[PDB]
């Protein structure tokens, strides 16, 4: 019934070959070849981003959608891509990342990118069972893809409910992954959340066409229906016609060394 639901149904009908070309058609991608090998060879001082997450956060920050500062909380930090990137930001003073880790999940990576000394990454943490703490900047990049739109909605609702307790502590800046923004009940939930805490939804072009993920960010302000519908229509339009080339880009160089605080 919604355009996003139409997109999801069409996505599930695609052959594996059509899906493969479709998911990268006209997207933005960072070149990670050089970063992956240095990280594999244990290079910690090359300015290499631990994951392609640093570039997704950089995209949002560089466009003014988020202005990180003070104490940053990174929920579902994984290897630490958002945490290490936030530590390079002048107004940022402390970064605390939390992640599940363990078998089948990303573990925090220890690197020496610029500002690494203000980053604490904690593994073995279930953020859904941890008490919210005050912070200035709240980041959350949780939301596992599913072929079922009901499973995506249930997972998004779980993330947004947990994030609610942290937003109650009133951070001035936030960036929250919204895995499933495209069902009718999700658009109503997001409009209510936007009226209460502000911000708006943004589509990052580094996201694959195989996900409808959007980011709820403190610096945006847009009609929920409009913003989600615009994304749904872009994703639907890429399902037909030629395969468009990927816009390749240099990955973020996060420099090296400590910061004085
Ligand atoms: C998409 S990744 C984050 C990528 C990260 N922003 C980066 O730039 O490297 C989401 C992470 O959240 C973790 N995660 C998922 N559910 C979690 C939970 N209940 N508690 C803590 N971490 C969780 C996953 O293990 C995964 O490492």
From Swiss-Prot:
Q: Which residues bind S-adenosyl-L-methionine?
A: 51, 81-82, 99-100, 105-106, 126-127, 141-142, 215
The annotated active site, in chain numbering, is 56 (for 2'-o-mtase activity), 141 (for 2'-o-mtase activity), 177 (for 2'-o-mtase activity), 213 (for 2'-o-mtase activity)
Q: Which residues carry this modification: Phosphoserine?
A: 51
Mode of membrane association: Peripheral membrane protein
mRNA cap 0-1 NS5-type MT domain: from which residue to which, for each copy? 1-260
For the region SUMO-interacting motif (SIM), what residue ranges are annotated? 72-75
Q: How is it modified after translation?
A: Phosphorylated on serines residues. This phosphorylation may trigger NS5 nuclear localization. Sumoylated, required for regulating IFN induced interferon stimulated genes/ISGs.
Spell out the coiled coil positions from the record: none
Q: Where is this site: Essential for 2'-O-methyltransferase and N-7 methyltransferase activity?
A: 141
Q: Which reaction does it catalyse?
A: a 5'-end (5'-triphosphoguanosine)-ribonucleoside in mRNA + S-adenosyl-L-methionine = a 5'-end (N(7)-methyl 5'-triphosphoguanosine)-ribonucleoside in mRNA + S-adenosyl-L-homocysteine; a 5'-end (N(7)-methyl 5'-triphosphoguanosine)-ribonucleoside in mRNA + S-adenosyl-L-methionine = a 5'-end (N(7)-methyl 5'-triphosphoguanosine)-(2'-O-methyl-ribonucleoside) in mRNA + S-adenosyl-L-homocysteine + H(+)
Cellular location of this protein?
Answer: Host endoplasmic reticulum membrane; Host nucleus
Q: Where does the record place the site Essential for 2'-O-methyltransferase activity?
A: 56, 177, 213
**Know anything about its domains from the record?**
Comprises a methyltransferase (MTase) in the N-terminal region and an RNA-dependent RNA polymerase in the C-terminal region.
| Subunit structure and binding partners | Homodimer. Interacts with host STAT2; this interaction inhibits the phosphorylation of the latter, and, when all viral proteins are present (polyprotein), targets STAT2 for degradation. Interacts with host TBK1 and IKBKE; these interactions lead to the inhibition of the host RIG-I signaling pathway. Interacts with host PAF1 complex; the interaction may prevent the recruitment of the host PAF1 complex to interferon-responsive genes, and thus reduces the immune response. Interacts with serine protease NS3. Interacts with host KPNA2.
Q: What is this protein called?
A: RNA-directed RNA polymerase NS5
Q: Which organism is it from?
A: Zika virus (isolate ZIKV/Human/Cambodia/FSS13025/2010)
Its ancestry begins with: Viruses, Riboviria, Orthornavirae, Kitrinoviricota, Flasuviricetes
């Amino acid at each position: 019934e919604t355009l996003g639901e139409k997109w999801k149904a069409r996505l599930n009908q695609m052959s594996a070959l059509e899906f493969y070309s479709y998911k990268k058609s006209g997207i933005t991608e960072v070149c990670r070849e050089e970063a992956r090998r240095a990280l594999k060879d244990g290079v910690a001082t090359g300015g290499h981003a631990v994951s392609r997450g640093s570039a997704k956060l950089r995209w949002l920050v560089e466009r003014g959608y988020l202005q990180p500062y003070g104490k940053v909380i990174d929920l579902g930090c994984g290897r630490g891509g958002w945490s290490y990137y936030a530590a390079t930001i002048r107004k940022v003073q402390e970064v605390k990342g939390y992640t599940k880790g363990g078998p089948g999940h990303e573990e925090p990576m220890l690197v020496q990118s610029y500002g690494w000394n203000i980053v604490r990454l904690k593994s073995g943490v279930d953020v859904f069972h941890m008490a919210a703490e005050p912070c200035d900047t709240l980041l959350c990049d949780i939301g596992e893809s599913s072929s079922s739109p009901e499973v995506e909605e249930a997972r998004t609702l779980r993330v947004l409910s947990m994030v609610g307790d942290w937003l109650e502590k009133r951070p001035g800046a936030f960036c929250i992954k919204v895995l499933c923004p495209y069902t009718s009940t999700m658009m109503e939930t997001l409009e209510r959340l936007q009226r209460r805490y502000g911000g708006g939804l943004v589509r990052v072009p580094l996201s694959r066409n195989s996900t409808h993920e959007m980011y709820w960010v403190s610096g945006a302000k847009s009609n929920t229906i409009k913003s989600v519908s615009t994304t749904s229509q872009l994703l639907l339009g890429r399902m037909d016609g030629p395969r468009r080339p990927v816009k390749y880009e240099e990955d973020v160089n996060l420099g090296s060394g400590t910061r004085a605080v």
